[PDB]
Amino acid sequence: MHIMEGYLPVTHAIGWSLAAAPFVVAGALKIRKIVAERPEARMTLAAAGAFAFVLSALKIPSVTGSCSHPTGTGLGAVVFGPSVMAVLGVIVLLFQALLLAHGGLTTLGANAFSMAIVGPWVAFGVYKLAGKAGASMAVAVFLAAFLGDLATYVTTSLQLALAYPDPASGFLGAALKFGSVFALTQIPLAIAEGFLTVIVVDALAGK
Amino acid sequence: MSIASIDRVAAQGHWRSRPLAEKSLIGLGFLALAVTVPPFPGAVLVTVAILAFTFLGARVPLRFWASVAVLPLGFLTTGAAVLLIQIGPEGIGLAPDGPAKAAALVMRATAATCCLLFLATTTPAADLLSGLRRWRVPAELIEIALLTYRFVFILAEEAAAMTTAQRARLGHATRRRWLRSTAQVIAALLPRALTRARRLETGLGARNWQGEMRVLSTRPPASARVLGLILTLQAAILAAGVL
Amino acid sequence: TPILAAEALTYAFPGGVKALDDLSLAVPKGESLAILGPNGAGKSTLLLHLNGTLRPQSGRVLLGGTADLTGWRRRVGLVLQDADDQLFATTVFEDVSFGPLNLGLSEAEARARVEEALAALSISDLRDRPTHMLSGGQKRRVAIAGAVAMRPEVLLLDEPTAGLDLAGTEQLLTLLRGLRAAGMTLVFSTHDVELAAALADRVALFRTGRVLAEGAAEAVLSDRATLAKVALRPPLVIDLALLARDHGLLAPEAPLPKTRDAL
């Protein structure tokens, strides 16, 4: 799900780490003011953070025989703010790379674009519109990690198209492909955690 | 899953005492190369360089890391296979020159990942996070990030425990049961966290402060000695790599 | 004959810590086994191992005398020291019900196996308590109840008196002892060795990874020398009564005062 280490060309790694920069700075300038406003912020945030990582290190039954680790994108959406997530996603992503050895440093920032910036902002629009579509809190969370999980698998497929066009079919070449090779894999996922985050948001209200 | 294995290794073998200053060069340097270096000449002798450093320089017992290492290899087996392939208005085919553009992808990544692995086996995530002291990233977010690393292992522990308890009591019988359950470990992990935050704040208020977080580190100062030496080596293996 | 055995265990954590180093162990039928030792000795590892929470590098356990386990966990339950990790759901009934129901137990058979559970444990309704609203004890009791609701042959649990008081300890002890009375095979691990004698009659000393001594609940607690290896001393009186006996014209030792008099 994450782009592994140095699987991006330096033009693009830095390419995306400059298209993330404007959004990392954004959140980190309000994290700036939250900690300025209320200094214990260092603790609610860090705890928010250390949740998502731990969340996504856990395992979940896939629709299919797969056994994937969820991706807090949808769950961290309805609870914490998206932007706040902009910085945290980056802070979570380090450890998934530093510890799980599943991320990557060069790609971190490429990753941070889809999992911290695209995945989330999208996960709200679903949520809030399904909210103003009249749908129940039940589904407005489900579609939110689902469509939201998609928005990664899409964005990460597109960054792999951009950095690896098609030998033949030009741009969209690798698109549908990547869109298809990681397409048996994550749409078990994007469905399962889509329910997972309903059960999860289930218990939250009740406590 | 997770990942107290790697963390504790990174704080128990020969090279964890010796400065962050230069393991974050050996690491971040050779990383930078592999991505940059044209591969066939390049990331081949980089790999053997960082690999030497990893197993010979800082003997790391694994040897066994590849348990750590492999988790990547299932992801790119496909990525590489994409390049192998495909497409047009024609059912069909292998690409012209797939197996170079693929084996040039492998050697680049594996290399950069051995750079990662080196960092992630010898430098503890904590150190690397204090290093951003010396570049931009303002103090706060380092404190938070040093604290996020902290709660990650005082939530990992309660999570293992919880999963364990369900797992008894037969957490595990159906599959849907397993999902259901795991939710009951994630749902039941957010407030525990938030609260664990606020008993932190009261606890620290002991000292005449709750926020801030200035700490004193016990790392050493990598003398500009190994500085020069390492830097030269890398720049070399460049030059030669760009040959 | 053994109900729960263990081959030279071998399990170690990283590269490798070798928390457990070739330790064979055995558990008889309807007992009270105290795996006595130092703290951070990872007795807990052994326990988890016993309940199929862990597979070792090299591992042998045993059932009715022989090497899918949803039979295993069934036969043998578990209660980890901290209660709150073990109590999931909202009210008391849920936690108990959930275990038998987790089991194919139909509404009406879980109906009546949460039966003894609450009773035998001595919680008393009310019922409630719920997910949380007390201190710590009562919680230990409910979790323990949860273990028992499931056809258990063997009960694995660590420190059955950690953080608890003496009154709490006394009550729990009484219940555990009674539970012994139902023919249950209990296995507990403990700092406090008062607790051992206050419950065990077979005691296995646990060092490094290794059961260096076992099997006379008294013997182990009277072989002072053995105790010093793992840095423990014998229970009060017995230690005294060893001493008292040395000076004391002493044949037998009794926790209630046995003191000689006059005159």
Next chain:
Amino acid sequence: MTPILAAEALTYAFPGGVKALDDLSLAVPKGESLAILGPNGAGKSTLLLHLNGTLRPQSGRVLLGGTATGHSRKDLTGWRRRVGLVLQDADDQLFATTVFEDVSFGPLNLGLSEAEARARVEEALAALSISDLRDRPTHMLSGGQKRRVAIAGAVAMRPEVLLLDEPTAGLDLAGTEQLLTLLRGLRAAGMTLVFSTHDVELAAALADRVALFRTGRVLAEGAAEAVLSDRATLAKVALRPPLVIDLALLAAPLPKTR
């Protein structure tokens, strides 16, 4: 002479709630080992919380050494420097990526440069016999060890008074006894020990005088001599005596005639 930390009332509860800390003005006399006692729900964990300043009681004032501090803000910073808290759960005062990095928090937001602070830390680490646990990470520490650290990080600042809260919780009699030493050693250096507990025999091992309370007021505050002992006095609270000697009708750390 005048007590070093005496608390009025002090008074406190939850708002919209049952009692929290009636008016129990316990006075401690510089250079002893008081042992607040009972099995909790009494709120010893809460008492301490006012004796550092964590909690502002609705009414009560505690006066440190001779007179009364200006809480609500600012002053407390001073109070803390004098008075120290070691909570039950060691994971509530350790953020603390390694041990050294933790302890060293103290003297740094305490008022001191870098070299001297390091020096001070190094003192406390040896003051709890953890100088060989200096640069290994906290969550990789046995339960006892991390109290020793959260105590170290506290004795790193130099308080006169050191509050503790259940300082033997989940320790084996080994690690319990070798603890004892390390803080008898502290009072011997001159530090006022104050601590909640419920295993009674501890106060029979470290305490000079003992406090007793249920409800919220302290009902019994004298020597552990004729506290520990006067069972009836014990009686009102749920407990019983340490073993000692059963009868004195003839005519804590083991002695014996026989």
